Design a protein around this ligand. Structure first.
Ligand SMILES: NC(=O)c1ccc[n+]([C@@H]2O[C@H](COP(=O)([O-])OP(=O)(O)OC[C@H]3OC(n4cnc5c(N)ncnc54)[C@H](OP(=O)(O)O)[C@@H]3O)[C@@H](O)[C@H]2O)c1
Ligand SMILES: NC(=O)c1ccc[n+]([C@@H]2O[C@H](COP(=O)([O-])OP(=O)(O)OC[C@H]3OC(n4cnc5c(N)ncnc54)[C@H](OP(=O)(O)O)[C@@H]3O)[C@@H](O)[C@H]2O)c1
Ligand SMILES: NC(=O)c1ccc[n+]([C@@H]2O[C@H](COP(=O)([O-])OP(=O)(O)OC[C@H]3OC(n4cnc5c(N)ncnc54)[C@H](OP(=O)(O)O)[C@@H]3O)[C@@H](O)[C@H]2O)c1
Ligand SMILES: NC(=O)c1ccc[n+]([C@@H]2O[C@H](COP(=O)([O-])OP(=O)(O)OC[C@H]3OC(n4cnc5c(N)ncnc54)[C@H](OP(=O)(O)O)[C@@H]3O)[C@@H](O)[C@H]2O)c1
Ligand SMILES: [Zn+2]
Ligand SMILES: [Zn+2]
Ligand SMILES: [Zn+2]
Ligand SMILES: [Zn+2]
Lengths: 352, 352, 352, 352
């Protein structure tokens, strides 16, 4: 079996491996459409998560079931499914507590391109098929559906953690593919005014399409200064961090009104500590709640997000700015994701 | 001062009263646009709430501040404002608990056309101006803005009580002006599939416009039977009761899946007890939560709802099917609301 | 294998069956101490749940693991464990939603003496051992530990559903073994004043021991009248229904203040509908939330409840008023539970 | 009027001022018993909150009403009341949002010894009497009741923010008078195992009395190392920060399991930023919620806490290790609070 993998930190390349076999509750799937993400770049080049050797990358894909284990009773070979980036082991204490994202350990729900071979291979392994797979309605376009496994589930999760109330004003820091989904998410939770912080024009247009009522560009001056000005010193009800450096945390605390919420969905790869401004946090008593969590996964999560797209509540296709054809282009899409060209949001590779 | 009032149960008419004066924290407002409601029909003809004598009716209006008390520091004469139907006394224990709707007692937050003169008069009294008034942006049309005081706040409240999750399937029982707002509310909370139950064609079109994906008509058979069929025996995640008789409660419990929520915003005027099916409620342990509450009010509530309309998140104008001009037409709009013509949703009377 | 079972509705007796075998994830346990519940009386004599034939009864027990399946990695033969009355199948959509009590259907989490042979036999089957079993510390007495499987978990669940705030006044309707645990539960959630409603002296003393500050006896007059008097017309913040007829629902709604919660843990076996007073429910808008649900189960639930007993936070032994020795006494304890003698709370049978 | 005040940062002394007068909704109260707090030390010597001039200190006291404004309808002169340290203005947007602690601005609910003269004077001013005062039952001892205005409300608030579930294991970092209340608070929310971190023997005994099952002393080694050892690498479900330096934040994040909560009630006076460990916070996705807030206040809050003490749910007297008699001793108690003698927890000054 052939697959695009991480040879060692800093080095990527194509490798040769054996086709995986399914257990009684597992399934083997082949990619119909895949997509790269900033996560793999952080892990490969920055070595954010230790060091791996010959580990296939990628964690966003849709495809068809090739073979299933003897116990899989909801999926048969041939079926087209949406595979969540987070495929947890449903039989742990963490699941009983309510946190499947950390089933087995901190961030353990995230297996692909972490502690398991990713989707950038002729085939990939999915554990607990009946629990971690969802049927993809033939009415949904491949390029759009491939945005569900991660970009959508993460962005929407930011809006969910933000405790948005009807009419509340929300600020989204960072408008990359995830940030853009966070904007659409805020609108889906009832937000009134939505302020997006970014720079690249491509992201700006997408932001407006998704619901952004105001765009703040970090160039015309400091973020906190501009937002405070825009809200007449009142600040925002909630802030969603979808990108930026460690210092973006300070900015977030500085713009949320007392009693507001700061919801983070950004993966911080550098720094030792994230700074929380003492004064702006009311010396520890401003009632400004800080949250941050891995995106949900599983069958149910996917089924619900599929319903939103199906019933035309959201249209993720606007995120796909580049489409490639062929297994070989996986390498191209990956590299393109590294040296971020000013007109790129999210590239997709159609395999069949 | 002249005003339309309830003489005694069953008898309505125009009366003559003295113009009210404001206290240091109060304000006197004159109606720019008003609108009748079924609530007043229930109270006048059915005597649902005891008996009143020469009490001016109505609780839905927008207008301008005529005079304010010595302490009112946020509103001056001439200012155009949106008046909430619920104007509570903000200094009570209930407010400290978090329920301003019952500030001073059960349903005490509702003063107009209950324990205080309504809006159907040349002038009306508003208590705690800085706490119960909101500036109306000149960009919002009068007929649309008059939908914010009651219809919108109540409908949206049903969706809030329903604990809707992204992608969840919601059922709205009753599609009158309030039901239609409940539909729009569910869409704003992230609902996927929304089923609306009604009959009159006018409401049906409005329902679809607001987000209804399926329409169920109580004529083609029993509601519960149809919905269960439509959802393949799975049922709905949440149900919002926006109309119907006492028996509609039984229907609601029958269609929600275990662990679901039943949110009521309907004002039951007849019956002694509302029936909760023992078997369908899992003999008391199906985890089906039942809620029901008076719509929120106050300045903050109105300001947030205004933002939704201002930023084009919702367009309430589609509820107004009849517009009249002149103080004298208040009586006409009222009568029209009683003998519900098949083409009526919500009538509005523009005074100036 | 011998066991006490339900032959047909109305007829009980000892039967002969084959010893069950465990699947790869299951376990076979033998009873060390058991106890009967009111539940089995309702099912056998009243036929509350259809009709069964030769089904072994009982859903409360502690014992040792006889044999385990090939996959069970946390429990070995010889180990002493606490078996929850609710043993759900952890791989269902309901579990992903968060309601393991209805895993597979409404009330599906409850298998023993329902859709599976109970504990009143030389051996019984436990599904998903690593997920539904908890090690019993040798410091906890058998008679006390046998109160954890149902009574404690159910009573405490009533307090959890009640949304009790620090200092809130709670009313517990019905002080049987479950009601008494509800009293102890309220105290553990921070309740201040706790009013218990009952009659039998034995339960009264137990109630006081567990935290009841006031005792209301339905004989000195109507419940609602007495409680309202005691609270100076203010009512209670929350009410937990732990017993009574269908009409107890009406009483509950009548005594809770607007915005309060009504939490039910009582199993209603008779009646067609449970009445919800229209006027007292504020005509559908008093904000009085009504809840009712099957007690939690599983390993985590039991482990946490064990910690409470271990660290002397609760002492369930006071519920055990009768202890018997020997397998043959199971029949006696059962009959005693039917013709409720005035001095009985909960009988226990020690087998070894 | 005489009173103990802050002359300038670093300098304290007795001053002479005019007796304050009440507004129509205010009241003037004289101290019956008062107590010093760490807060005043931070403000006076460290200048944590700008610079004040001749501002009377303290904000923890019980006393009797001397005179009331014309509108005060619940309190008359002579009545003994408990005065909350937090006395907010109940008519602000923040109150409508639900955060009275920040009514008027960040930390604006805290007036005494901040932006208003404290309680260390012959008389002091209380705004909104009917909203910010509670009748003190004559059965409660003065020294115990003086612990309610702030020590109790803050400690309990830590347990409330921690989202404690029945049986959960909680860690309390810092066992000063506030930490000790947080311990008692955790027990009141249903905690099973409670680990307290401290050193001074006096605090240790009090900790055990209040519910601490394990005591960790920062001397036998690093906190995180010891706790992780004690929990067998599992960690704690929640952590309450009741004392320590800025680095205690890092420690808190390091000991809570993924999905747990970190509740802070400690007032950080030094440092620029509070460090949040990137790796231990799962790079921003460990689902570890961080909260921090000013203690609640108002009449309702006090009434409920009074009920807990009245019904013997808690006994705060154990916090009072030093009692003084006479207005002159206020200076002594204050100084004693500065140079913390190893046998001090909380000193009280009885005035009459
Ligand atoms: N583990 C998972 O499954 C998972 C899932 C979703 C997301 N994540 C993580 O969350 C982050 C999401 O990134 P993405 O995929 O949406 O793409 P991205 O292009 O990295 O998005 C970054 C966004 O924030 C920006 N930004 C950079 N510096 C900023 C600053 N100083 N202030 C404010 N904004 C700034 C960008 O602006 P311009 O581009 O306009 O310059 C852009 O809008 C990544 O770190 C990703 O690893 C992880
Ligand atoms: N106190 C307040 O401030 C307040 C605020 C909002 C609402 N409310 C109350 O809540 C209710 C809202 O009514 P509304 O103003 O929206 O107007 P409405 O016209 O009374 O709405 C009733 C809706 O439910 C219907 N319906 C009648 N029988 C039904 C049945 N048997 N099964 C299912 N649906 C049935 C109608 O169908 P067709 O019309 O299609 O026949 C209609 O769609 C009223 O009782 C009102 O008093 C009170
Ligand atoms: N499925 C499960 O796993 C499960 C678990 C727990 C509980 N449950 C159910 O919940 C209920 C719990 O009962 P229990 O085991 O605690 O024993 P119980 O003895 O049946 O408890 C009944 C309590 O309520 C009483 N009561 C009777 N009529 C009343 C009335 N009219 N008004 C107020 N109180 C009245 C009793 O008073 P006196 O005894 O003082 O007369 C007693 O205190 C049962 O129906 C049980 O089946 C089911
Ligand atoms: N604004 C308000 O109304 C308000 C209300 C309540 C509390 N607060 C604030 O919250 C804090 C509460 O302090 P307090 O009154 O309870 O008295 P405290 O004596 O300052 O309490 C400090 C506790 O944490 C300790 N500690 C010191 N260094 C530590 C370290 N490195 N690691 C772990 N623990 C350490 C102490 O241990 P030993 O004493 O055993 O050495 C003591 O147990 C204060 O900063 C106070 O200003 C403010
Ligand atoms: Zn990704
Ligand atoms: Zn109305
Ligand atoms: Zn039972
Ligand atoms: Zn203090």
């Amino acid at each position: 079996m052939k697959g695009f993998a991480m040879l060692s930190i800093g080095k990527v390349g194509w490798i040769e491996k054996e086709k995986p076999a399914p257990g009684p509750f597992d399934a083997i799937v082949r990619p119909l459409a895949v997509a790269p993400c900033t996560s793999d770049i952080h892990t490969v080049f920055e070595g954010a998560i230790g060091e791996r050797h010959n580990m296939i990358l990628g964690h966003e894909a849709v495809g068809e079931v090739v073979e299933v284990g003897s116990e899989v009773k909801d999926f048969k070979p041939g079926d087209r499914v949406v595979v969540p980036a987070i495929t947890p082991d449903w039989r742990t204490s963490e699941v009983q507590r309510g946190y499947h994202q950390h089933s087995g350990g901190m961030l353990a729900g995230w297996k692909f391109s972490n502690v398991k071979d990713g989707v950038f291979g002729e085939f990939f392994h999915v554990n607990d098929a009946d629990m971690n797979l969802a049927h993809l309605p033939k009415e949904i376009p491949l390029e759009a559906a491939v945005m569900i496994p991660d970009m959508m589930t993460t962005g929407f999760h930011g809006a969910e953690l933000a405790d948005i109330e009807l009419g509340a004003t929300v600020a989204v820091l960072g408008i990359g593919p995830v940030g853009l989904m966070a904007v659409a998410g805020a609108k889906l939770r009832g937000a009134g005014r939505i302020i997006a912080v970014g720079s690249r024009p491509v992201c700006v247009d997408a932001a407006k399409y998704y619901g952004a009522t105001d765009i703040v560009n970090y160039k015309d001056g400091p973020i906190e200064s501009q937002i405070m000005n825009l809200t007449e010193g009142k600040g925002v009800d909630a802030a969603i961090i979808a990108g930026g450096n460690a210092d973006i945390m300070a900015t977030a605390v500085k713009i949320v009104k007392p009693g507001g919420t700061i919801a983070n969905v950004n993966y911080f790869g550098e720094g030792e500590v994230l700074p929380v401004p003492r004064l702006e946090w009311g010396c520890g008593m401003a009632h400004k709640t800080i949250k941050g969590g891995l995106c949900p996964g599983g069958r149910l999560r996917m089924e619900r997000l599929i319903d939103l797209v199906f019933y035309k509540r959201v249209d993720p296709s606007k995120l796909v700015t580049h489409v490639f054809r062929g297994f070989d282009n996986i390498e191209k899409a990956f590299m393109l994701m590294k040296d971020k060209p000013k007109d790129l949001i999210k590239p997709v590779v159609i395999l069949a």
